[PDB]
Amino acid sequence: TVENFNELPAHVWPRNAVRQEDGVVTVAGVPLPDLAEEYGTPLFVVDEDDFRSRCRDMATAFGGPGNVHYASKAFLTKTIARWVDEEGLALDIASINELGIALAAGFPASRITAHGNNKGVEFLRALVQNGVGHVVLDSAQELELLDYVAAGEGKIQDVLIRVKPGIEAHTHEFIATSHEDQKFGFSLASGSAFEAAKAANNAENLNLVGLHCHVGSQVFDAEGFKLAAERVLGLYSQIHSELGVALPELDLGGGYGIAYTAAEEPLNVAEVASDLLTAVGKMAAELGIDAPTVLVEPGRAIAGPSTVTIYEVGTTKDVHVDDDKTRRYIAVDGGMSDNIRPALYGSEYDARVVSRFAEGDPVSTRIVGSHCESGDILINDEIYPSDITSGDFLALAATGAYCYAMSSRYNAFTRPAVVSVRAGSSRLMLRRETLDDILSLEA
Amino acid sequence: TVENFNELPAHVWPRNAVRQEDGVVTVAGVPLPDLAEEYGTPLFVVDEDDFRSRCRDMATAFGGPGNVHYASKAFLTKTIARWVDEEGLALDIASINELGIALAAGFPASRITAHGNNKGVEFLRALVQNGVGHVVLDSAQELELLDYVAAGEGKIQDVLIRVKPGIEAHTHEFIATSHEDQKFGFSLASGSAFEAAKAANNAENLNLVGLHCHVGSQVFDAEGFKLAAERVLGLYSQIHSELGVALPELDLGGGYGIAYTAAEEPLNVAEVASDLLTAVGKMAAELGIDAPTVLVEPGRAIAGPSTVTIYEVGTTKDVHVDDDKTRRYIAVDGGMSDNIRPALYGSEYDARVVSRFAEGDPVSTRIVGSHCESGDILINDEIYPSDITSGDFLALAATGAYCYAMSSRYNAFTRPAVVSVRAGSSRLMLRRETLDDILSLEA
Numbered sequence: 072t073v074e075n076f077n078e079l080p081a082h083v084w085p086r087n088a089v090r091q092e093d094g095v096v097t098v099a100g101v102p103l104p105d106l107a108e109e110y111g112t113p114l115f116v117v118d119e120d121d122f123r124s125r126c127r128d129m130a131t132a133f134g135g136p137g138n139v140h141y142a143s144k145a146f147l148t149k150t151i152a153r154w155v156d157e158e159g160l161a162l163d164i165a166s167i168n169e170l171g172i173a174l175a176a177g178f179p180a181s182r183i184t185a186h187g188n189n190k191g192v193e194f195l196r197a198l199v200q201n202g203v204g205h206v207v208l209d210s211a212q213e214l215e216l217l218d219y220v221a222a223g224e225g226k227i228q229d230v231l232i233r234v235k236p237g238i239e240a241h242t243h244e245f246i247a248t249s250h251e252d253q254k255f256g257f258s259l260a261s262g263s264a265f266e267a268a269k270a271a272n273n274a275e276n277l278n279l280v281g282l283h284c285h286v287g288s289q290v291f292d293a294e295g296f297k298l299a300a301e302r303v304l305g306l307y308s309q310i311h312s313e314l315g316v317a318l319p320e321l322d323l324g325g326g327y328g329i330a331y332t333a334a335e336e337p338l339n340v341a342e343v344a345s346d347l348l349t350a351v352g353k354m355a356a357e358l359g360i361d362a363p364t365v366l367v368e369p370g371r372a373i374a375g376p377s378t379v380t381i382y383e384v385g386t387t388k389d390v391h392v393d394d395d396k397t398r399r400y401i402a403v404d405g406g407m408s409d410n411i412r413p414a415l416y417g418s419e420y421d422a423r424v425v426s427r428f429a430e431g432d433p434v435s436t437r438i439v440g441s442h443c444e445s446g447d448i449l450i451n452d453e454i455y456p457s458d459i460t461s462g463d464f465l466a467l468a469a470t471g472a473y474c475y476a477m478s479s480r481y482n483a484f485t486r487p488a489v490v491s492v493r494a495g496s497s498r499l500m501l502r503r504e505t506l507d508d509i510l511s512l513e514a
Numbered sequence: 515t516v517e518n519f520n521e522l523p524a525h526v527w528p529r530n531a532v533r534q535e536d537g538v539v540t541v542a543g544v545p546l547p548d549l550a551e552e553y554g555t556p557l558f559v560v561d562e563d564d565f566r567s568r569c570r571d572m573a574t575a576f577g578g579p580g581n582v583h584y585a586s587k588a589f590l591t592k593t594i595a596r597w598v599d600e601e602g603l604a605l606d607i608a609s610i611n612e613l614g615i616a617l618a619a620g621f622p623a624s625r626i627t628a629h630g631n632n633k634g635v636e637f638l639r640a641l642v643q644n645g646v647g648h649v650v651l652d653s654a655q656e657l658e659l660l661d662y663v664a665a666g667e668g669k670i671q672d673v674l675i676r677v678k679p680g681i682e683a684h685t686h687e688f689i690a691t692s693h694e695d696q697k698f699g700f701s702l703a704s705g706s707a708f709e710a711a712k713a714a715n716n717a718e719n720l721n722l723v724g725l726h727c728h729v730g731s732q733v734f735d736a737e738g739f740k741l742a743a744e745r746v747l748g749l750y751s752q753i754h755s756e757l758g759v760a761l762p763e764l765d766l767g768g769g770y771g772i773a774y775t776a777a778e779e780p781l782n783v784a785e786v787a788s789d790l791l792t793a794v795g796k797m798a799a800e801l802g803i804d805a806p807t808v809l810v811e812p813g814r815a816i817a818g819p820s821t822v823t824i825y826e827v828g829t830t831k832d833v834h835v836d837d838d839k840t841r842r843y844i845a846v847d848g849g850m851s852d853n854i855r856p857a858l859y860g861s862e863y864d865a866r867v868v869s870r871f872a873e874g875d876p877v878s879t880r881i882v883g884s885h886c887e888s889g890d891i892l893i894n895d896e897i898y899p900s901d902i903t904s905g906d907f908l909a910l911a912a913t914g915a916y917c918y919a920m921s922s923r924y925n926a927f928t929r930p931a932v933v934s935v936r937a938g939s940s941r942l943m944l945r946r947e948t949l950d951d952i953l954s955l956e957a
């Protein structure tokens with residue numbers, strides 16, 4: 072109905088977003104239509120306090136800022152690095168260039184944890200040389216090469232070992248196997264995780280501080296994580312009783328969910344954190360071991376909800392699908408270049424006109440981008456007002472995670488600008504790419 | 515078997531690729547390992563004569579190089595535009611920046627055909643002011659707006675109108691429907707393509723020269739194209755007999771296929787073009803109309819096979835999939851950021867070691883990239899020798915189309931270098947990105 076489309080689901084949109092009485096949406100007091108006209112569309116707009124409030128919600132819930140690592144895979148700039156730094160969080164990195172961005176923004180290396188399934192020797196040297204907090208080991212080969220690079224330098228390197236406990240946790244279900252057929256870490260079940268722990272114990276230039284796992288995607292309760300944790304704590308016990316070693320940390324990954332659409336419930340960190348910590352505690356007690364410090368690695372659940380993407384509506388048409396059955400197609404000025412996720416995973420997004428109220432009769436609508444392929448589809452099948460039209464600004468919610476980071480130059484489109492908002496003003500974070508940027512790779 | 519892996523299927527790999535007798539693969543006389551060591555991995559290597567010789571195969575098959583548009587969306591630089599220029603081909607463009615690249619290469623505007631489902635007023639003006647040969651009209655709104663823009667300037671702009679005939683042509687089949695539920699153009703069966711040709715004729719500042727359709731993907735015979743052509747020419751006949759207009763041109767789009775893996779047959783363009791042009795002549799004559807000049811718009815089939823992507827192998831491990839059964843994971847230093855197509859579309863690629871012969875026992879193997887998510891998978895499930903190892907150079911064939919254009923900076927990976935080779939020497943086309951490219955969007 073027209074009513075529902077003119078609302079703004081608070082649990083999806085950014086915390087400081089508001090539908091004004093004229094139909095305009097503001098984020099931190101700044102009208103979205105004014106940002107679009109000042110910076111051009113498409114536009115990524117980041118609610119800065121929203122980002123920070125999700126850092127603090129995470130921090131409270133897992134017992135302090137330094138047990139929460141921000142997964143920079145979701146979105147990383149110098150600005151974001153500094154926000155994360157200021158809130159006292161840890162930072163997850165996964166390539167030499169992400170490390171580069173972090174160091175360039177002043178981010179202390181001792182609060183950096185380093186992931187990667189295929190870390191080269193250049194990347195390792197840089198990590199050890201800058202005295203990074205943790206290196207998370209993927210393979211026997213990384214383990215041996217990290218030892219040589221550590222010995223080659225002064226240093227001893229705090230490491231975690233990635234373990235596959237055989238749990239894959241989703242929104243409505245988790246799936247349990249003996250082994251995970253995937254490229255990361257060591258199997259728990261073949262003993263291979265235990266032999267990696269042994270080898271890192273023995274290594275003179277590595278200090279083993281705990282195990283890591285990552286089992287979740289868009290998770291809203293703790294039950295998959297509890298079963299992951301039980302299994303991994305079986306291994307903390309085997310390590311304790313077979314090697315005598317106590318492990319201070321347990322790193323349980325991210326995969327914490329956010330609501331993308333009005334029907335989905337928002338995440339409740341505090342409940343999820345309360346259930347999981349408690350369970351760890353009872354489990355460590357039952358096994359006769361020290362309850363390790365739980366570390367977590369939210370990407371999506373910190374960066375995601377803070378950000379929207381504004382497009383300008385261009386072409387509209389009624390496309391025949393049978394003899395008098397039509398579907399309304401709305402073209403916007405970006406597409407799969409700035410949001411690849413509906414195409415790649417089937418992900419559904421909430422869209423709203425943020426320039427006005429709609430009055431049109433609701434009809435079956437598809438939002439498409441401006442690229443010359445079918446499949447460049449942002450919203451597949453919804454019932455939206457039929458007076459959405461050329462010159463309206465339309466935004467999608469929850470584009471702060473993965474979208475910008477997965478953006479392409481398909482059809483030579485320029486990566487969009489990222490602007491941040493706070494206390495009624497807007498700061499440019501990332502300028503819009505230009506045709507000159509593209510052409511400069513040819514000089 | 516190991517013997518099959520050590521071959522180089524000629525029909526897949528660039529035309530000037532050879533397996534030397536030490537196992538090293540050369541393209542246009544340049545050993546691929548020397549390029550890897552010279553310009554870093556990952557590397558796109560383009561066999562320039564291959565690219566040219568496919569321009570020539572198309573040109574001979576469709577009756578002169580002016581009838582063939584190269585579909586820029588596959589891959590476009592100033593260098594590619596210059597080659598298309600020199601070979602005598604038209605160039606189909608889909609955005610204002612693909613136009614900009616072409617014009618900065620000095621590519622003649624009168625040989626440019628412009629596409630787009632949501633052409634803005636800036637873009638239309640650039641096109642009209644530079645005097646592009648054709649604008650392909652996608653909606654009633656672009657038509658009226660292109661008429662206005664053309665009035666504003668001196669001119670009468672030549673146009674084609676995109677038509678959806680209800681045909682979707684694939685490798686082993688075609689699918690025929692009365693309407694096409696997709697974003698582009700006007701239905702044949704509703705009457706809306708007729709109304710559109712009626713309005714383009716009428717327009718004072720538009721000259722209607724033909725229809726356009728694009729029906730195919732990875733097509734190897736003319737059956738689907740033929741039926742698409744039958745249906746569209748039925749509209750040529752209706753136009754002549756209800757408006758008295760004769761249309762000189764007919765653009766049948768691209769969608770011509772290339773062999774990606776060894777089991778596939780290569781395209782026979784000579785035979786496919788003969789069968790289609792012959793049928794078009796027979797249908798035109800049966801309908802009592804002039805036989806239009808047939809235009810075609812290959813992308814994949816000009817650019818795909820000319821190019822390979824070289825990687826360095828990093829990490830290797832046997833990954834347990836249940837208690838007794840393993841799968842060999844080989845990681846390489848790029849991934850979904852330089853080739854999104856296995857993940858996005860499920861596309862298979864052929865992979866070979868290009869630095870030496872392999873001797874090892876053949877085992878179930880999966881090739882993965884270096885990004886932190888499962889599903890960053892280049893080759894899902896093949897059987898390759900078990901001595902493939904760290905420091906080997908591995909290459910995928912047929913990466914000349916859609917791969918570089920769809921690359922992203924996920925995990926802040928830099929876009930790879932693109933090198934062309936000809937007559938035993940190598941030329942840099944696109945420099946590798948750096949961290950300073952990534953940081954510069956903050957400054």
Ligand SMILES: *Cc1c(COP(=O)(O)O)cnc(C)c1O
Nearest residue numbers: 142325326327368369370371886
């Ligand atoms: C994927 C991943 C994350 C975060 O995933 P979200 O769904 O964004 O929480 C964190 N750490 C590692 C190592 C990962 O691979």
Ligand SMILES: *Cc1c(COP(=O)(O)O)cnc(C)c1O
Nearest residue numbers: 443585768769770811812813814
């Ligand atoms: C995709 C497309 C083509 C060519 O596709 P290939 O499969 O690379 O031949 C040509 N014209 C238009 C308008 C397109 O959208």
